Every structure is written in structure tokens, then in C-alpha cells.
Amino acid sequence: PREAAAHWVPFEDKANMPDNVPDVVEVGATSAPLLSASYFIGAKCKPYNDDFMLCREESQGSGAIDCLKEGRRVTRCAVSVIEDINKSCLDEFRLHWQCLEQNNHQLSGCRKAEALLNKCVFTKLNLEKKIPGLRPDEEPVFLKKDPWIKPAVDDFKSVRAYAEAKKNGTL
Amino acid sequence: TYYFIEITIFLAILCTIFIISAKNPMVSILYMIALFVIAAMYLYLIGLGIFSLLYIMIYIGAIAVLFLFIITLLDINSTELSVKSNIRDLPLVLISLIVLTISGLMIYSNDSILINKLLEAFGNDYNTIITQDWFNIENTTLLTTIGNVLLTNNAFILLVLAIVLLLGIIGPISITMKHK
Amino acid sequence: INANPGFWNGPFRYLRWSAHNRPHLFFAFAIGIAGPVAALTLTPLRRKYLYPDHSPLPQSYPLPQRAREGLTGFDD
Amino acid sequence: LWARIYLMPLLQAEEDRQTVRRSIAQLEREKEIMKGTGFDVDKSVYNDGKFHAPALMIPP
Amino acid sequence: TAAGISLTGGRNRCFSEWQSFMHCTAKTDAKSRAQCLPNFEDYMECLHHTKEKARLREIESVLKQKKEGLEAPPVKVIPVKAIGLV
Amino acid sequence: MIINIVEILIFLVCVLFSVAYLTVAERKTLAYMQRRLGPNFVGYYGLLQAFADAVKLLLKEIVLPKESNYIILVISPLITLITALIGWVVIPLGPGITLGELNLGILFSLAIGSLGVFGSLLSGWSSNSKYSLLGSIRSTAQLISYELILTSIFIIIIMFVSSLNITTIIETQRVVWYCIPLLPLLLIFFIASVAETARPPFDLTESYSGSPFVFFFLAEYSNIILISAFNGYLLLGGYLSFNYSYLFNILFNDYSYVSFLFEGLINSSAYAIKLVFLMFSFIWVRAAFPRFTYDNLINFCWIILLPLLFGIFLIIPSTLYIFDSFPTL
Amino acid sequence: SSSLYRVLRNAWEVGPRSYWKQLNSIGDTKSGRLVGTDIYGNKFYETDHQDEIHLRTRYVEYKEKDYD
Amino acid sequence: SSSTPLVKTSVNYSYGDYPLIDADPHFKRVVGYMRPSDYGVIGLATAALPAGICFAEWLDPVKGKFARPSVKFLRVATMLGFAVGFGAAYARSSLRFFGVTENAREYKKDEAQMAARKAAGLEPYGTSSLTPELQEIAAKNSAHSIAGLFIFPWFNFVNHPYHGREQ
Amino acid sequence: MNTFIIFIILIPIVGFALLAVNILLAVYKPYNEKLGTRLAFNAAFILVAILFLPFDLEISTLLPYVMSIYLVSNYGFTIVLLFLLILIIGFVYEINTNALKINKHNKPNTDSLIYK
Amino acid sequence: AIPFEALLPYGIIFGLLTAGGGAMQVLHVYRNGGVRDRFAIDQWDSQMMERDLRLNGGQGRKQVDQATAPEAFKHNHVWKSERPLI
Amino acid sequence: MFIGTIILVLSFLGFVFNRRNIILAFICLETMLLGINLILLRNSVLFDDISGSLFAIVIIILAGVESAIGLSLLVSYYRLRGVINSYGI
């Protein structure tokens, strides 16, 4: 919760899970693919994530050990979403997070690639990108036309793919 | 680069001894400015990078400037550290050094026992384990939370503090004007 | 030479006098009191006509208040 | 903000499993240290039975 | 007040032990306070880590005298240049 | 480790050349404003004259008077040289191009600018004469009196960003600069910047040899370009010129080192053209105006500018309040 | 004038050889007529060009590198 | 959402003989519910400060023989008299909300008003432009601030959800 | 090991080098003719730097607020308004008293020419 | 009209700062490995950068996108042990 | 806690055995306040909370105001006596 100062030295641990708890395979996506598919991880895995944090609230202070069985399932369902999005939308998911690794991982600067990614994932994986807590009479930010905050330079691959999706009639 | 805190502790000792024994009154004040810099070094060292620049801005840039500004246009006599003057002081200096030092080290401890109170101040050797938890989603740094709690939970302290700043305006004026 | 009439002998005449002869103090106090008076009197008009207020940003993970109802998914 | 809280339980489960594994590893390690000598390493110094990650290790 | 507010505006490190102690002290009147002695103890050594320092000194006193030292899954130290190297 | 030391000696060679040529530039445009030529005697068109002057003044006799602390008198040049130069880290020549990217950059730029008062006041205690003291008193009194309103304008600008990072302010200024809404603040900040160096619009105390002279000389013009840098990032656009996305989608096809080279050229050309127009305006206001009495100066700061600044303190959070527009971290 | 066009066209009229010597002698660029030379050897020039100020029409090119 | 109090709170914990109305009333409700005797207290204090200065001059004059005080003193006396009278009337009227003085005139007005706000289909204490965390902190600041009227004036202007009542 | 600290240590190297170059390079050769109580001051001189500090402490008291400005929205705004106005009242004290003036001691001697 | 000589030292000031900014941007991109710098880094994004250095294998911001994480990823996890703070 | 304790103790004893001038007493007072700051900010870091940071940011301002007040007090001490004695007030 506080960060290490004044000569911290890092250390790691040559050990294993005990036999009591089964194997769980991990998430291997880094920040730009994780930030790219964050809304679709949240759209599919909402009741699993909320049961995990509700576990953590319910049995206070035990925490780690009494919530492992649902921390299993949140990781497995997010892995399901990520390979689902790989095998359907690999090239434009890659287009999106390759836009996102420039521009400080700001979602504000990658609108023309995220329109393509949202259209693919919505027609093929049937998951929708939504911002909750947003009452009506309020436009969502990634839908608006001519925003005030444009990026410095639009990425070339995504504006080329965006124009070709215009002329195909994809989007 | 392990012994950094120890080095700042030692250099702070040495700087205070140069403060209290100095030819010229403003040689002593420049040693105080150096002690402020050693303080800000320790504060960045422990993890408080905000406070160190607050110390350099407020203490060095306003209080030391006011102090040097006073020494310039006022006349202050000074004796220097004669040995005839001050080794009459030294036996009580030594007794009070050891007593006040041990006694300041005493109150971090909870024992019935006197020197178990003392040597738990030196039981320092264990290296704190820093864990990452992903529960915080935004850049609330320390100045943000000081601005939240000066302004919501301790808003009355901020307004009584405004009265104190008001007094720091009114008082020096009220002394030094000689109204007509 | 221009003397001070005082705020009390004539109010609006003193306001005109201060605007002509002490313009830094008059316009400093003008800009100063334009702030909180419009903060009082204009923001209900904006909430009525221009646009209502934004919804609050989340600060933590949002915990709902339920009892971990059983879900048949990822039983493996 | 909503993106980060969609990502939070996914990484929290991660660091929870890392905490459980390394703490049980340290517990077994000091059990393997003080074999022979009668001493309880499994016992918490906290009086409540809740689980806690260890701190304050000896520098290597 | 700023009773349990941390540096990030969250709850501090010993908030949960303190809130357990206050849950204790809310449902008790005096003449009956001797039973919430453990919670307070749990709070105080949350603050100062006195019993953990005592326990770790007791175990370090034993590992200093072994010729064998450590027969365990050991712990590695890395440079900061090499967190994910291999 | 080859990378950062080559980067820092590239930055040092750029800024310590550009503080030398600012001197050659002020003599030439002061001359042409006065309808005469500048120097053309020492270079092909007058250049490396600051080099000629530095070459000669590092040959000049140093006089340490009867009256003087010798140590205090020659390390007040260095403490003013070093803190007039330390503030050159945090300025960005592009998004994230500083010598140290720290999240509290304005707090640093504001703490170093308060360290610059000492080498006036302290060096009054050098050569202790009764007139060598109260002139330094008037100097330091003006210095602190105008860094007050400097700090004030900074905190007014941070009411729009709510972040002490500096390139965050410049990325925030992409939608509009901060001079276009707050143009009285550009006027107030320009005159406070002119006072903070004690430029000869706002000079009174003017009106050594060798190393204590060239250190003060370099500190003066480094302070010129440093407060010009402060104006360039928080009030004008820092490295921002226009959109230049359509021009790139014409020219380039993918990220290459020549494209990053071209983008850095455009960004720091915008930053440098702001800074150069600002230094020209410093010399241009030097050319046209007489100087101040101390009483006109103190009356100006404490009685005229500061109440107006209190009005600005009240007016700007109130309009950020009327329309529900508070900046988020 | 103070123009760049004037120094431009005078540098083109006088030529680069003569430009480098006139840059190593004076700061200006001047296009003359060679009215005559000295018994010491000092070429003199008169400039008829329109954008000249009073007291600039006539000048000397010396012989030695230390000139009087 | 924006009216759940999320704390535990006194329920009808009356501070005197008489039942409470609010645990801190809003400023508008205090100005709305004050009696003609309270406006008489405001007028009494507005009259008593300049008359008091004239009186204390008539007792012991400043420069030896009696003059009236200047009008510059009488106007500041009347301004501070309105300040004393408004502090007195606000404290008097807040006492009726707490149930330490007689409030049967105002208890009828509050049951009428909360019945009207149930009939109008809106929230019982007002929609506020604050997050519920800030409403809670803002009402911890102004809770029972009528004690300590001698030191500082402090009022309630936040429409926070809890007032020491049920349902 | 960042590019921040080479600067911190390298600017002195710049200075130490240059004043070395002159002290190492130039003529010293001084003599007596080349080499070479207390006065009273007005109150506004000492006053400008004494009253400087309470305004400076206010300006760095705004610095926690303008970083927290979103979180305390509509509430910390009014607390800051009251803070600023409480200090504006001490400032209008200061400029109503004409404190920071140094005023000239000799007039035209306005008093008229009467006779007998 | 416009003196070219007056504006040439401004021209060299402009050119020196322009070339410095361009050379420094390419030095930053060469340090990152072909991408731009991150100009404002949260505590969250600091933790995210160290996690991605753990996941990619050695490299700074290579930014792997893999289905499921490797074998040494469960074992290369780091805690930080900070000194006594005397 | 060591650095704040020793700067406070050495600052205190330098204040107490000051016989040479008056401004050493002022600067020993300010360094005492610095040592109190050091101890408190370390405790705030170790306990993971802002409340020691709250008392520290308030005592910074109070130390500044006391320096302003007391140095105007010294100036008024100096008004009637154009000298400040070495032995003390």
C-alpha cells in the first residue's frame, strides 16, 4: 500500500503451491492488451469478479486463503475472454494495443482502432463495451464526434485500416 | 548505497556542532541552511519527496531569508567560543546529553523494565517486507490527501490557521509602525 | 485634488469616485466579489437550463451488498 | 477508471496466490530451520485466528 | 478527523485491527473491559511489531549457530536490472 | 549508461551555448533598436563575442577586499550559478523529454527559484560597507516581493490541471493554451518575470572581476531563459504548435527513427520559437523604459498587483464552480 | 539599408574571393567602381547604388592586414 | 444512491422534554420557522447596541463633556447589533428543533412538510450536489454547531440525508 | 543512475572548472591602493520582508487545495473561499493602514502667511 | 528593413534548442526500443510496468500478448525487503 | 527516530548553553522544530497514514508564523537600544 524507499532489495521464492489447492493457469497479457480488453473482461466476468470481492468482504481478515476458489475462477474466465478475442480478432486487437503502447496508454488517442475492435468483438464475440454509472442525457466519451481532446499523431496502420473499413462498408 | 540514512544522521550531528560554534553569526546561519538541506535529503530518503521540496521552499526560502535579512541591517555583538567561558558548562552538558539522549530514546517502548525500554529502541535489524496490492485505482498522492483532510475533516483547523496567519500579519505591523 | 466623500454620504457617488480615482482597488474588489456572488446566484440556473451535474467517479472497487449466490460456471 | 476496476480482481487473485505460496514457503522454511529445538513456528503472534502475511525478514 | 485515513486516502495499515477493537469497545461497558484485552494487543503489535521482532530474534539466534544453515527451498536475491531475466 | 550521459552532455552543450549567444543577441538588437550596428568585430558576423569576453574575463585579476569574507564572496557566485542552472532539468522539449521526469516538477521549479535569492543577499555581506549592505537589502526585498506573485500565478494555473507534473500541463494545453483565456495573467506574469531577474525596467540597485563576475553573468541570463521556459510551459503552449497529424499521414507510413526525429524537431522548434520571442520581448522592454524608485516598486507590487491577484484567486475557482468543471487528477 | 537582399546581391556582384576578403576586412558587403589606386597601394571605390545612406558612398580597400 | 446514510445514528434521541425535529436543521428551515418573538429579539439587539453606546457615553463621556457619538459609530453598532440578533434568533430557533424548548407550533409544520414531500415524490431532506461521503463529512462538521456560538458562527447548508430520525 | 543526478553533480563541476581556470590563469599582484558604525533605516524596509512571510505561507497553503480540487467539489471550495476571505481582510487592514510606505519627511510647508 | 545580423544569434539559439530537442527525442526512443516515453506514471502504472517486465522476460516494454502465461512466471515473483529505516 | 531525537537534543543544548549572541537562540529554536518534524514524519510513514503528515504541515506554518512574530519582536527590542548584547537580553 506504501511503496518501498531507502534501499529496498528484491527477493523471490523457490517454492510451490501445496497439494491442497489445484493448478490455475495464469494471465500472460501485458498492460496494453490488458487495458485493451479490460471492458470485455469486465463484460463477461462481472458476476465472477463480484463474487470474488464479495468473498473478500464477507470473511474479513482471512482474506487470501478463504477466497482462493473464486480467485481461481476469475483468472480462468479472463483467460477465456483473451483467447476468445485472440482467435477471432487478433489483427485489430493487435492494432488496438499497438496503438496503445504509444501515447502513454491513453485511451483518448486510439479511437479509430477501438471503433474497429468494438465492431469486431460485438458482432463475433457478442460482447458490448459500456460505461456504467452513466445516466441517460449523457453521451459516452468513446462515441462522440469531434472530441476536444485529439491525440498528437494518429497511428498510420489504424487510419489506413479505418479508411479501408469505410470503403468496404465494414464500419 | 545502504548506509545513506546513517550518513545523513552523522552529517546532521556534525552540522549542529558547526551551528553552535561559529566565528560570525551568519556563518552559523549558513550552517543552519545546510542542516535544512540535510533534513530534505533524509525526507526524500525515507520516501517523502513532497516534503523535502516543501522544506526547501518554506524553511530555506522564507525563514532563512528573513533571518539573514535581519542579521544584515541590525547590530549583534558576539563572543566566540572561548574555552574559559564554556568548560564551566561541560559537566552538566555531558550529564544532560547522556540523560536527555537516553530519555528521548526511552519513550518508544512499553515495558515495566527500564533498560528493556532502552534496548528495544536498538532492536532495529529486521527488514520490512513490502507487498503489492492492486486496490487503488488513481493518483492520489500525499499532497492530494493533505488537501482532502485539511479541507473536509479538519476544515476548522484550516480556518483557525487562517486566524493565525492573520495574526502574523497584524502583529508585526502593529509593533513597527508608529502611527503618525 | 480629489477628496474622499465616504461610502456613507452617498453610496453610488462613492462607487463612481472609486472607479475614477482608485481604479486598482475598485476593480480588484469588483473581480473579487464577482466570484462568490455568481457562485451563489448562477449555478441553479445552469443546473436548470444548460446541463445537470455529472455522475460521480468511482474511487474503490465497487462492492455490491449480496451474499455470494451460486453460479454454475467454471466449475472445473 | 472503469477500465482499472475491471482489471482489479484479475490482478488481486494473482497477488493473493503469490502471497499464500511465499508465506507458506517461509513458514515451512523456518520449520526446517528449527527442527530439533522445541519451538512453535506455526503459531501466530496475533491473538486472532485470521491469516496474515509475514513481515520483518532478516537481510540476506 | 483523520482517524483511519492513509497516505492514499484509503484505510491505514492497522485499520482493521483498530476497527475490531472499536467493535469490541462499542458493545461493552466498563466493568467488562478485561475481555477486549486481546484485540488491543492485536492492535498494538500491529503498530509496533514487538512480538514478531521477538519471534524473529528467537529464530535468528538458532540459525546463527548451525553449521548446516539452511536445508530448504531457499530465497534468491536479484539486482533490480534482472526481475524477469530468465 | 552510455545513453544517459550522452543525453545529458547533449542537453548541457545546447543550453550552455544558448545562454552565451543570448548575450550576443541582446547587444545586436539593442543596437538596431538604437539605429546602430551591433558587434561585427570578432566573428564573421559578430558571433563568438561572448566567447571573446569569457576568454578575456577568465584572464582578469580577482580582487578580494580588506572588508571581505573571501570564502563567502567566491562561493556566492557558485551557489547562484548552480541553482540558476539546476532548474534546467524539468523543462520538456517534447512529451516526456526532460532530464528527470518527476511527478512534482512545478514544486521543484518553484523550490529552486526561491533558492536564487541568497546570492544577492549573502553577497551583500561580502565587502561589508554600510552602502554595500542596504543596497543588497533593497535588492533582496524586491526579489522576494515579486517571487510572491510568481508563485501565485503558478498556483492559479495549476487550478486548471490539478497536477504538479509539467508535461501533463502541456498535454492539457492541447485543447487551448492558457494565455488565450488568461491574458491579463500573461501581462502580470511577464512583468513579474522581468522583476524576478531584476531587469533594467525594474532595476534600482545597479542604478568584482573575473570568475565572480562571469558566474553572476551566466546566472543572470540562465535566469532569463529559465523564467522564459516557465512562461513557455504554463502560460503559452509548451511544445505545441498545431495538430500536424494530417501532414504526417501524407508524409510517413510507419514509425521510424526519422519520424521520431522529425516530430522532436517540430516540438522543440515550437518550444524554442516561444522562448526566442520571449527573450526578444525582454530585450525590447529593456530598450524602451526608464527605471523605478524602490517606493514605486513596492507600491506597485504590494498595493496594485497583489489585490488584483486576490480578486483572481476568488474569480477563477468560482467559474470552475459555476460550470461544474473541476479538473481531475 | 539593413537588408539581407543588399548583402545578397552585393555578394553576388563582387564574387566569393572578394567577398571573403571584404568579410575579413569590414563587416559590410560593398560593390564599387575602382576610381583609382594609391602610391602606397590602396584601392578606392565609389558606390552608385540607390539604397545607400549618406557617408557610405566611398571607401578604401587596403593592402596590408594591419591597416591605418 | 445519494441518500443512503451508510452510518448508524440516534433515532428520536430528544435533548429535553420535548421531541426533536432535526439533529441539525438546514439554514432555510431555521429562517423559515422562526417566531415573531425571534424577530423581536433581532430588533431588540439592533436597537440595543447604538442605544448602549449613547448610554455609555452619557454615563462617562470620552473627552470630558457629553456629545453624541458619531454616525460612523452608530452604523457599525447597528450592523453588529443585527449580527448579535441574528445569532440569538438562530440559536433560539435551533433549540426548538432539538426539542429543548417548546416546539408544538413547529412540529405540526414539519409533519405537514414531510407529508407534502412524500406527496410530491422527492427525497425527504433534499437532493444534494455532493457524494454521500462528502455529505457525511459535511454533516459531521455542522452537527450540533449551535453550541459554541460564542466562539465561531457555523451553519448547515448541505442537504445531507440523516437528521436523527427514523424511516 | 538516471539522467537527473549527473546534472546535480555536473553543474558544480562546470563552476569549479571555470573559477579554477581564472585563479590558475590570471594575475594576482595586489596592493593597498587597489584594495578597499551603522546606519538607521525606515520601518517599511524591515516590514516588507517580515510581512512577506505570512502571505508566502498562505500561497503554499493553497497548494494542498489545488491538487485536491476535484475530490472536495462544492464543499472544499467554500472552505477555501472562507480561508481566502479571512486573509483578504488582514490584507485590507494592511493597505488601509498605509504600512509599506516610506513617506517623505519635508512638505512644501502648507501653513499660510499671516501677519501682526 | 529586417536586420539579418540581429536575428542570426536568435537563429543559432533556435537551432541549438531545436537540434537538442530532436536528438533527445531520438535518444529517448532508442532507450525505449522504438516507442515513446511515458510522461506521467501512477503508482498503479508503476506496478503495471514492473509486472510487464516480469511477464515479457527481461525486456523493458516488449509487451507480449500471450494466451496463458509461461512456467517461470509463477516463480519469478518479487517482494521488496526494505532496510531498518534508522 | 534517531536523527530527529539527536537534532532536537543537540539543538536544545546549543540553545541552553548559548552565551554568545541572540540569533543562535532563534536558529536553535528552528532546528528544534525541524527535529520534531523529522520524528513525526517518520512515524507517519511507518504507520501508513496522513495524520502525522497533517500535524506536520500545520506545524510548518506555525513555525513560520512564530519566526515572523519573534523577529519583529527582536526589531522592537532593537528600536530603543541600537545594540544587541552578546551575553543576552
Side-chain angles (χ1 to χ4, degrees), chain F residues 106 110 146-160 178 182 184-193 230-231 234-235 305 309 312-313 316, chain I residues 59:
Chain F
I106 303 147
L110 195 43
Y146 287 93
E147 63 94 9
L148 191 146
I149 65 180
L150 190 78
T151 312
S152 304
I153 290 154
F154 289 177
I155 286 166
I156 290 160
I157 289 301
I158 298 161
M159 285 169 185
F160 291 154
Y178 288 156
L182 279 62
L185 204 75
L186 183 70
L187 194 42
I188 295 291
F189 187 77
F190 182 75
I191 70 187
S193 66
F230 292 170
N231 198 349
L234 55 86
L235 211 36
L305 260 66
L309 199 61
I312 295 164
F313 285 137
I316 287 185
Chain I
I59 301 304

Side-chain angles (χ1 to χ4, degrees), chain B residues 61-77:
Chain B
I63 295 168
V65 180
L66 175 65
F67 279 7
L68 264 81
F69 187 91
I70 289 295
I71 299 160
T72 306
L73 48 82
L74 279 87
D75 196 42
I76 290 142
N77 293 125

Side-chain angles (χ1 to χ4, degrees), chain F residues 4 58 61 78 99 162 211, chain I residues 1 3 19 22 28 34 67:
Chain F
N4 61 344
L58 276 292
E61 188 207 38
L78 282 177
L99 304 180
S162 178
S211 292
Chain I
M1 57 83 65
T3 172
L19 62 80
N22 196 14
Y28 181 55
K34 180 185 303 187
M67 289 300 295

Side-chain angles (χ1 to χ4, degrees), chain G residues 18-60:
Chain G
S18 191
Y19 186 73
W20 277 96
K21 183 169 71 172
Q22 284 183 7
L23 198 50
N24 282 155
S25 76
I26 72 182
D28 213 17
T29 318
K30 297 288 252 181
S31 297
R33 203 194 83 218
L34 201 73
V35 283
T37 177
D38 194 341
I39 196 68
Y40 202 62
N42 286 310
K43 319 296 295 189
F44 284 17
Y45 295 92
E46 184 175 2
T47 70
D48 290 335
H49 288 297
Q50 185 68 260
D51 59 357
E52 294 293 326
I53 317 156
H54 189 65
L55 313 171
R56 304 288 308 272
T57 291
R58 307 208 262 268
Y59 63 96
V60 51

Side-chain angles (χ1 to χ4, degrees), chain E residues 11-80:
Chain E
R11 298 160 168 206
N12 54 14
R13 193 185 58 192
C14 294
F15 184 73
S16 309
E17 292 87 342
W18 187 41
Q19 199 187 342
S20 77
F21 180 66
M22 298 307 275
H23 274 104
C24 236
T25 64
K27 63 177 185 186
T28 190
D29 192 70
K31 178 265 299 177
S32 155
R33 292 290 174 112
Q35 67 174 13
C36 302
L37 173 65
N39 285 318
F40 182 68
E41 285 171 355
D42 293 348
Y43 182 59
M44 287 304 295
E45 191 265 323
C46 181
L47 291 175
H48 297 98
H49 298 294
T50 296
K51 292 176 175 179
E52 283 226 274
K53 276 177 190 185
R55 183 174 177 276
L56 293 159
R57 196 171 288 271
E58 180 139 341
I59 76 166
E60 198 267 340
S61 77
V62 166
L63 66 87
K64 286 192 294 288
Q65 58 91 29
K66 290 180 178 283
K67 63 180 186 295
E68 296 173 349
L70 186 141
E71 287 83 11
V75 294
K76 176 85 165 56
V77 167
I78 47 174
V80 311

Side-chain angles (χ1 to χ4, degrees), chain F residues 19 23 26-27 49-50 52-64 72-81 84 119 123 126 206 208-223 286, chain I residues 15 18-20 22-23:
Chain F
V19 294
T23 298
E26 54 81 28
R27 283 170 72 177
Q49 195 198 24
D53 293 19
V55 168
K56 189 189 60 81
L57 281 204
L58 276 292
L59 306 164
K60 201 57 151 157
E61 188 207 38
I62 302 104
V63 298
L64 60 93
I72 291 315
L73 187 36
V74 187
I75 322 194
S76 61
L78 282 177
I79 299 303
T80 294
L81 178 78
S123 67
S126 304
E206 300 286 331
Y208 306 150
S209 323
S211 292
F213 184 73
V214 157
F215 286 140
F216 285 163
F217 187 85
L218 263 181
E220 179 182 1
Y221 293 97
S222 178
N223 286 333
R286 164 174 185 156
Chain I
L18 190 135
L19 62 80
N22 196 14
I23 289 173

Side-chain angles (χ1 to χ4, degrees), chain J residues 11-50:
Chain J
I12 288 109
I13 288 162
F14 178 77
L16 285 166
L17 293 168
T18 297
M24 274 168 84
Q25 171 77 49
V26 166
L27 283 177
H28 279 295
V29 174
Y30 182 73
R31 176 178 303 170
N32 294 125
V35 295
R36 297 176 181 174
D37 313 285
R38 306 182 44 109
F39 63 89
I41 295 169
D42 207 358
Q43 168 179 12
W44 178 270
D45 281 298
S46 300
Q47 290 180 358
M48 196 59 79
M49 284 174 79
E50 69 190 359

